[PDB]
Write a protein that binds this DNA or RNA. Structure first.
Ligand SMILES: OC[C@H]1O[C@@](CO)(O[C@H]2O[C@H](CO)[C@@H](O)[C@H](O)[C@H]2O)[C@@H](O)[C@@H]1O
Ligand SMILES: [Mg+2]
Length: 580
DNA sequence: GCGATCACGT
DNA sequence: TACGTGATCGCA
């Protein structure tokens, strides 16, 4: 069974062919400034294993790695590229990434290692990484004999599976999606992650001090109002203090007891003064624990930068996710938490943070896909879309639209995009079911094209077995035919929403690629730092702001051409908070 | 360790 | 109502 390969003590010419499956192993989940434990190369001349100290010190190998004409097939090339960047080594010529290929073929498989991807094609001559390295406390690099065969088997799998995966991608019309979108994007993400974002740690530490004080205060007030101490951070103990010791009304229940979600607490506020305090305490506690303490834990002490990792092969819709730290969920709704952004600053003196965001990209994408005359016209006039919906569903002139009417029309717009049900619309607007249903009905009368799209997309999902996005990304929906109403309904909402969220994902990804090409042509020093679903955050010399104000929005607006215009707003300042 | 519940983002 | 990450609790 053992697979044959050369355990090389030195790099040789035949190891540098112009086409090879390459494995540059980084076992640490967070690959930033992490160790490379081994290298495997499989090509026309055979299978090879190279120790990193050797390979990475060989100028011929390093040259081969950076030679864009020497093509490499890999799995999670971003991981290798970044780990190499920290060692001052450039990786070029990656023409096939099995992780991204598998992700595009079926995001639902959750492929996160070569073995998982290989299984899709009935290839099982490779072990799962977890089986080799273990997990958690037991996770460690095996002895060279075991490590070497594993890396060679992974490279061998990649070598064998490239053609099969490319053939299916082609059949799915996703060949360009991999080659012209995801693979180029992977390199851009590597640059962004490697660059990192500078943090004003002293500012965060000061906020932490101010929060600790406020928490202690509110914390005491809570015990005083409850005439006793308990773990406020325990939905369990809290549920007892509120619904048992204080007799507060039980408006909502959970799977294991009473609900203490902010949602319910808001309704309970009128009954007792402790509720407001619990809400406030949670607000502050989230800021302290997740953001202040959290960020401080991952900031690099030497550079004061945080280096997130953008998981490019995880979400079912094509969006990216961000981890350790997640820089796509930094507070902004509430002013107090929003101030956390004042701690994200430019990495160099006299540089500024520039942020550009698409305005209502989901609803604009919906107008395009559904080809709804009323909705397309609304955007062609660049109308306030929520006021417009209110005018239509409540039958009133612009002047007759009250704040509450807009607030509700807004909730309906978001619900439509999410495939909201008459019930979930009530839960959100805290209204009835038949009422929320009447709203939805009024919406479809005003936007018949959208109603038709929602009906047609669900039928298409049932017929084909999947739905697709603008750039041909796909998501299988087997539950669309489930005879269990709830399971089927969730699938139906996904059928309606995925093409919208997914196409919006496609668009900003292409914008990022187009943008970097533009930045290079103009030789601007400006560069991307983050992507937050419908917005791009960059940093650049103050002298480049005027050029960026015109360049960034244009590139983002022209990424794709829809039946309605794409609109991008932008702001810049001395900190992320100020880029408003 | 892991499911349940909470809260942060688009 | 769509899509995420993660801190904390509590029993295994
Ligand atoms: O390197 C990112 C890439 O690796 C996968 C596994 O193939 O995720 C690993 O790394 C992430 C970043 O540290 C972790 O969040 C995740 O837990 C770990 O398995 C892919 O999912 C991802 O695309
Ligand atoms: Mg926006």
């Amino acid at each position: 069974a053992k697979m044959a390969f050369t355990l090389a003590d030195r790099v040789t010419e035949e190891m540098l062919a112009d086409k090879a499956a390459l494995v540059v192993e980084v076992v640490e989940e967070n690959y930033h400034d992490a160790p490379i434990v081994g290298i495997a190369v499989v090509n026309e001349h055979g299978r090879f294993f190279l120790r990193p100290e050797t390979a990475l010190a060989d100028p011929q190998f390093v040259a081969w790695l950076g030679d864009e004409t020497k093509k490499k097939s890999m799995f999670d090339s971003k991981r290798a590229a970044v780990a190499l960047k920290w060692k001052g080594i450039e990786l070029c010529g990656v023409s096939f990434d099995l992780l991204l290929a598998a992700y595009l073929l079926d995001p639902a498989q959750g492929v996160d290692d070569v073995a998982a991807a290989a299984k899709m094609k009935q290839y099982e001559a490779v072990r799962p990484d977890e089986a080799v390295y273990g997990k958690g406390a037991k996770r460690a690099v095996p002895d060279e004999p075991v490590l070497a065969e594993h890396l060679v088997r992974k490279a061998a799998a990649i070598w064998e599976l490239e053609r099969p995966f490319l053939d299916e991608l082609r059949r799915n019309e996703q060949d360009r999606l991999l080659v012209e979108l995801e693979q180029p994007l992977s390199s851009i993400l590597a640059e962004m992650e490697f660059a990192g974002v500078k943090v004003d740690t002293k500012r965060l530490e000061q906020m932490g001090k101010e929060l600790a004080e406020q928490l202690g205060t509110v914390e005491q007030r809570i015990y005083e109002l409850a005439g006793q101490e308990f773990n406020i951070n325990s939905p369990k103990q809290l549920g007892v203090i509120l619904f048992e010791k204080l007799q507060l009304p039980v408006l909502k229940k959970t799977k294991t007891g009473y609900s203490t979600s902010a949602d319910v607490l808001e309704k309970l506020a009128p009954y007792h003064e402790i509720v407001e305090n619990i809400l406030h305490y949670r607000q502050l506690g989230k800021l302290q624990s997740t953001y202040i303490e959290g960020l401080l834990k991952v900031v690099r002490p030497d550079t004061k930068k945080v280096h997130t990792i953008f998981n490019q092969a995880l979400t079912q819709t094509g969006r990216l996710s961000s981890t350790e730290p997640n820089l796509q969920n930094i507070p902004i709704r509430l002013e107090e938490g929003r101030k956390i952004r004042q701690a994200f600053v430019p990495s160099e003196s006299d540089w500024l943070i520039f942020a550009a965001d698409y305005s209502q990209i989901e609803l604009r994408v919906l107008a395009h896909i559904a080809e709804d005359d009323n909705l397309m016209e609304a955007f062609r006039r660049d109308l306030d879309i929520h006021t417009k919906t209110a005018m239509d569903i409540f039958q009133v002139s612009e002047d007759e639209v009250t704040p509450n009417m807009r607030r509700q029309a807004k909730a309906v717009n978001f619900g439509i995009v999410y495939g909201i049900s008459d019930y979930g619309l009530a839960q959100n607007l805290n209204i009835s079911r038949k009422e929320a249903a009447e709203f939805i009905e009024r919406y479809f009368e005003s936007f018949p094209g959208v109603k038709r799209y929602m009906e047609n997309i669900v039928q298409e999902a049932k017929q084909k077995g999947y739905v697709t996005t603008l750039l041909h990304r796909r998501r299988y929906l087997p539950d669309i035919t489930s005879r269990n109403f709830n399971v089927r309904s969730f699938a139906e909402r996904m059928a309606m929403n995925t093409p919208i969220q997914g196409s919006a994902a496609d668009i900003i990804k292409k914008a990022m690629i187009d943008l970097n090409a533009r930045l290079k042509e103009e030789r601007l020093q400006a560069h991307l730092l983050l992507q937050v679903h419908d917005e791009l955050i960059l940093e650049a010399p103050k002298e480049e702001m005027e050029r960026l104000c015109r360049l960034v929005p244009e590139v983002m607006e022209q990424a794709v051409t829809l039946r309605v215009p794409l609109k991008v707003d932008y702001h810049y300042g001395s900190t992320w908070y100020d880029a408003k």
